[PDB]
């Protein structure tokens, strides 16, 4: 729905453009198995990018970042070949991370702390030096784990996730994919909308570390609108809205839609407003912090 190829069958890399490209077809390529992931494989849902969709340069970059930082691949690339008209196809290739069996499933809360970036360092990097380098990493990761917070995930889900490990016997990307959904299902079902599994740690032997951000609230925005939606100032009122927010909707708490509803129940009861919204949105830090946004249109 905008933009064009590099003319023509040349294969462009991820750096270009101020406009929204359209993608004719998506390919998901597995480097080690030398196969392609079918559109019905459901391992294809690792990709949020669908054919015929429109995405800016910034959006395709977040996709590559999400695939790279999740821990299921030690190499994952995103390339594209410009197609004659008027779109370009993309190829997401990858190499599954190297895994063993796992008898322990650990969940650590990385909300508000620094995210794991793949950060692959220099190769060769000699024999005895590389062997020390892994020990360097792992000692850092044990530091990161104990640095981290408890998660909210209740035991039975650990019980289920553990079984799936015993059932496969060896960790693959396909299994982590199921685990991430099962863990994420629980958070969302219980009302935590902004919770996500941001990574899978392999650095501890026979142990899967699941890093989640539960959606910690870092910010509160009260925005008055009218009429048809432009922002306007609410002067002397703004404190009277804040008292109607529950304790769990303020900063230092995990966002749950239950608190948004009670906030909505509270603010409604004042009888001052025609239109009221409570929506979370990610703040600019990308560490999992949440902005609580409240949109209001007055009566008078």
H or E element that contains 280: strand 273-282
The β-bridge relationship of strands 217-225 and 231-232 is antiparallel
Q: How many residues does the chain have?
A: 300
Task: Yes or no: say if 60 and 126 are a contact pair by the CB < 8 Å rule.
Answer: no
Strand partners, 276: 296
Task: Yes or no: say if 226 and 232 are a contact pair by the CB < 8 Å rule.
Answer: yes
Task: Yes or no: say if 267 and 276 are a contact pair by the CB < 8 Å rule.
Answer: yes
- Edge-first strand order for the sheet with 104-109 is 104-109, 207-213, 196-201
Q: With the C-alpha atoms ordered 20, 21, 23, 27, is the resulting torsion angle positive or negative?
A: negative
At 255 the three-state DSSP class reads coil
CA distance 120 to 44: 25
CA distance 11 to 73: 23
CA distance 226 to 150: 43
Question: Resolution reached, in Å?
Answer: 2.9
Sorted by sequence, the CB contacts under 8 Å of residue 213 that are 6+ apart come out as 109, 110, 111, 112, 194, 195, 196, 198, 287, 288
Rg (CA), the chain: 23
At 149 the three-state DSSP class reads strand
CA distance 257 to 266: 14
The β-bridge relationship of strands 217-225 and 290-298 is parallel
Core vs surface per residue 80-117: b (16+ CB within 10 A) or e: bbbbeeebbbbbbbbbbbebeebeebbbbbbbebeebe
What sections of the chain are H helices per DSSP? 57-69, 127-147, 155-168, 173-189, 238-242, 257-268
Experimental approach was X-ray
CA distance 13 to 80: 6
Closest CA to 200 of 173, 228, 236, 238: 173
């Amino acid at each position: 729905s905008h933009g064009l190829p590099a003319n023509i069958v040349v294969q462009l890399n991820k750096l270009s453009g101020f406009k929204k490209y359209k993608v004719s077809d998506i390919m998901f390529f597995d480097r080690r198995r030398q196969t392609t992931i079918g559109t019905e494989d459901s391992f294809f849902e690792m990709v949020s990018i669908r054919p015929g969709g429109v995405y800016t340069k910034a959006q395709l970059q977040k996709e590559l970042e999400t695939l790279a930082t999740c821990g299921m691949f030690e190499k994952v690339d995103l390339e594209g070949k410009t197609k004659p008209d008027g779109t370009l196809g993309v190829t997401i290739s990858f190499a599954e991370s190297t895994w063993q069996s796992a008898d322990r499933f650990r969940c650590i809360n990385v909300g508000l702390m620094v995210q794991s970036k793949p950060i692959e360092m220099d190769s060769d990097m000699t024999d005895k030096e590389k062997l020390e380098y892994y020990r360097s990493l792992e000692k850092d990761y044990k530091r990161r784990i104990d640095r981290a917070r408890p998660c909210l995930l209740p035991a039975p889900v650990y019980g289920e996730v553990m079984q799936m490990l015993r059932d496969q016997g060896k960790v693959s990307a396909r299994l982590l994919q199921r685990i991430r959904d099962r863990v994420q299902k629980w958070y969302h079902d219980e009302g935590y909308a902004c919770a996500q599994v941001v990574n899978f740690g392999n650095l501890n032997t026979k142990e899967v570390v699941c890093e989640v951000v539960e959606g910690d609230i870092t910010q509160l925005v009260i925005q008055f609108q009218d009429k048809l939606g432009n922002v306007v100032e609410g002067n002397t009122q703004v404190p009277v809205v804040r008292r109607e927010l529950p304790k769990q909707l303020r900063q230092g708490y995990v966002f749950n839609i239950e608190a948004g509803k009670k906030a909505l129940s509270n603010i409604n009861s004042l009888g001052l407003f025609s239109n009221i919204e409570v929506n979370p949105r990610p703040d600019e830090k990308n560490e999992g912090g949440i902005i609580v946004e409240i949109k209001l249109k007055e009566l008078e």
